[PDB]
Amino acid sequence: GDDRELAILATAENLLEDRPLADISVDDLAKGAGISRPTFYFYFPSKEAVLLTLLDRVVNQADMALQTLAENPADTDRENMWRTGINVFFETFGSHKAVTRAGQAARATSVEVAELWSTFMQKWIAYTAAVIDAERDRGAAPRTLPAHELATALNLMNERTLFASFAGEQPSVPEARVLDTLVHIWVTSIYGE
Amino acid sequence: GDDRELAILATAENLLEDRPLADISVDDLAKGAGISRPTFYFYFPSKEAVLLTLLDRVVNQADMALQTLAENPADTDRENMWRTGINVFFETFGSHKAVTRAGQAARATSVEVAELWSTFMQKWIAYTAAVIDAERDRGAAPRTLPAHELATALNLMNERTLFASFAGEQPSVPEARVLDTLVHIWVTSIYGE
Ligand SMILES: CCCCCNC(=O)N1CCC(C)CC1
Ligand SMILES: CCCCCNC(=O)N1CCC(C)CC1
């Protein structure tokens, strides 16, 4: 019923590991899901609408996990608090590299993708800034930069840096080193005078 | 003679302020340069080869300026040393926003662009790492992260962050705040324990 939808989504994610969206046809999506081309079009208006949904589930999965984290503070030092948080994005997006990769290229092309990306980045930065302000109220962090400006730049560091390594871009931090690399820069910029 | 070449380049840069490369024709480039379509094709094989050259001159201008900077150390504190360096990329790319913007989208499309980007990023990161290692040998910076890993992440922060503000992306640091924002994170991650 809507299992067909889930089949189209899985087919697309599987196919995107091996070629870009450009070299995948609706034909290829329908085939994989075991439906006709016109039945495909019942569920989605384009291959692009399939990417968008994929990215939507990845982004919301990241977001929900961060909500679960924020509701249950891990009992640990500040370094470990930040690491646990950044890890939500490392694991989540790192488990969906094809979708991550395709979503990011699609930003230049698709206004819906760009907006979806935009909404969640705003949210996570807002959250980052809230935690930093809390850390300054507490007395644990110095009032250096505007919290929102710092949060913005740290989050953009994480987008670029997580995605370069996920794609094996030259240059990039190796994936097995990227978590530590980011946490250092976060902790040191948030706590440093 | 090759003034026609310079005319094509200026026409393209002027046109790119107002629409993407997709909505600019070879016709539009030839017109602006005051040549025929076939004479255009004498000088460049595509609109894309025109972008590539544009980006090449922007990137080399950035690079040469950093070479001039490295050869003549500005006599100042460490914060100001880094700021002066990051400023080379702020000013250079910030004076060529249309080209910057178009080059970055073209990375997903054009393998020549991606490689050109790749080469210079490797160079600037290598330079960043060399300066940090020097700062650790001097005794001025602690041996925290692997210098090259740190350099990689800081440079990727700068790419993403400079270009988001240049494009007025939501979200982004405002352009009049981005220099200070970056220098803070650099100095604090390089000098911090
Ligand atoms: C895919 C990267 C998108 C943004 C990455 N943001 C990020 O790392 N955060 C968000 C704030 C949390 C407290 C943990 C750190
Ligand atoms: C367009 C951004 C590309 C990379 C930006 N790199 C950057 O800011 N650097 C390079 C190292 C210098 C010592 C100054 C700081």
What is the secondary structure of A111-141 as a DSSP string? HHHHHHHHHHHHHHHHHHHHHHHHHHHTTSS
Could you tell me if B72 and B168 are in contact, meaning their C-beta atoms sit under 8 angstroms apart? no
Residue A175 in tokens:
């994936």
After which residues are there C–N gaps above 2.5 Å in chain B? none
Q: By what method was this entry solved?
A: X-ray
Q: How many domains does chain B have?
A: 2
- Whether residues B32 and B51 fall in one domain: no
Is A152–B159 a contact, with Cβ atoms under 8 angstroms apart?
A: no
Residue for token pair 């650790």: B136
Neighbouring residues of A56: CB distance < 8 A, sequence distance ≥ 6: A116
CA distance A77 to A83: 10
- Report CA dihedral (B133, A177, A89, B132) to the nearest 10 degrees: 0
The C-alpha angle B97, B98, B101, rounded to 5 degrees, equals 80
Residue for token pair 């439906």: A35
Sign of CA dihedral A55, A61, A66, A67: positive
How many angstroms does the Cα of residue B182 sit away from the middle of ligand 2?
10
Sign of CA dihedral A37, A42, A45, A47: negative
CA distance B182 to chain A (A): 7
Could you tell me if A112 and A51 are in contact, meaning their C-beta atoms sit under 8 angstroms apart? no
Run of H or E including B93: helix B78-94
Interface of B with A (CB under 8 A): 105, 108, 118, 121-122, 125, 144-146, 149-150, 152-157, 159-161, 164, 169-174, 177-178, 180-182, 184-185, 188-189, 191-192
Run of H or E including B47: helix B47-71
Instruction: Report how far apart, in Å, the C-alpha atoms of B119 and of each of B47, B58, B59, B108 are.
Output: 22, 14, 10, 16
Does ligand 2 come within 6 angstroms of the Cβ of B128? yes
- Whether residues B70 and B26 fall in one domain: no
With left for phi above 0 and alpha for psi between -120 and 50, is residue A152 left, alpha or beta? alpha
Return the DSSP state at B140: S
The C-alpha angle B6, B165, A87, rounded to 5 degrees, equals 125
Instruction: Report how far apart, in Å, the C-alpha atoms of B160 and of each of A158, A179, B29, B73, B104 are.
Output: 10, 18, 29, 27, 10
Residue for token pair 């490797």: B122
- Whether residues A27 and A78 fall in one domain: no
Q: How many CB atoms lie within 10 A of CB B85?
A: 21
CA distance A163 to A159: 6
CA count, 13 A, side-chain hemisphere, A121: 22
- Whether residues A64 and A29 fall in one domain: no
Residue for token pair 């380049």: B9
CA count, 13 A, side-chain hemisphere, A159: 24
CA distance A63 to A70: 10
Q: Give residue A24's domain range.
A: 1-46
Give the DSSP letter string of A68-116.
Answer: HHHHS--SS-HHHHHHHHHHHHHHHHHT-HHHHHHHHHHTTT-HHHHHH
Instruction: Report how far apart, in Å, the C-alpha atoms of A184 and of each of A84, A88, A146, A192, B6 are.
Output: 13, 16, 20, 11, 46
Nearest ligand to the CA atom of B156 = 2
Residue for token pair 């030839």: B30
- Whether residues B85 and B126 fall in one domain: yes
CA distance B136 to A146: 29
Instruction: Report how far apart, in Å, the C-alpha atoms of A43 and of each of A54, A59, B5 are.
Output: 14, 21, 50
- Whether residues A147 and A173 fall in one domain: yes
Could you tell me if B32 and B11 are in contact, meaning their C-beta atoms sit under 8 angstroms apart? yes
Could you tell me if B142 and B136 are in contact, meaning their C-beta atoms sit under 8 angstroms apart? yes
Instruction: Report how far apart, in Å, the C-alpha atoms of B19 and of each of A167, B28, B34 are.
Output: 29, 12, 20
- Whether residues A14 and A68 fall in one domain: no
Give the DSSP letter string of B1-46.
Answer: --HHHHHHHHHHHHHHTTS-GGG--HHHHHHHHT--HHHHHHH-S-
Return the ligand 1 atom nearest residue A151 CA.
11
Interaxial angle between packed helices B147-166 and B78-94, expressed in degrees from 0 to 180 and rounded to the nearest 10: 40
Neighbouring residues of B24: CB distance < 8 A, sequence distance ≥ 6: B12, B15, B16, B47
Could you tell me if A128 and A70 are in contact, meaning their C-beta atoms sit under 8 angstroms apart? no
Q: How many CB atoms lie within 10 A of CB B93?
A: 23
Residue B146 in tokens:
């692997």
Does ligand 1 come within 6 angstroms of the Cβ of A85? yes
Could you tell me if A94 and A175 are in contact, meaning their C-beta atoms sit under 8 angstroms apart? yes
Out of B118, B169, B181, name the one closest to residue A150 (CB). B181
Could you tell me if B179 and B87 are in contact, meaning their C-beta atoms sit under 8 angstroms apart? yes
Q: What single-letter amino acid sits at B63?
A: D
Return the DSSP state at A53: H
- Report CA dihedral (B56, B61, B66, B69) to the nearest 10 degrees: 170
- Whether residues B37 and B87 fall in one domain: no
- Report CA dihedral (B94, B95, B96, B97) to the nearest 10 degrees: 40
CA distance B104 to B51: 11
Q: Where are the beta strands (DSSP E) in chain B?
A: none
Backbone angles phi, psi at B81, to 5 degrees: -55, -50
Is B185–A152 a contact, with Cβ atoms under 8 angstroms apart?
A: no
Helices (H) and strands (E) in chain B, counts: 9, 0
Return the DSSP state at B141: S
CA distance A47 to A33: 13
Give the DSSP letter string of A18-50.
Answer: TS-GGG--HHHHHHHHT--HHHHHHH-S-HHHH
- Whether residues A80 and A167 fall in one domain: yes
- Whether residues A119 and A169 fall in one domain: yes
- Whether residues B140 and B154 fall in one domain: yes
Closest CA to A186 of B164, B154, B136: B154
- Whether residues A65 and A31 fall in one domain: no
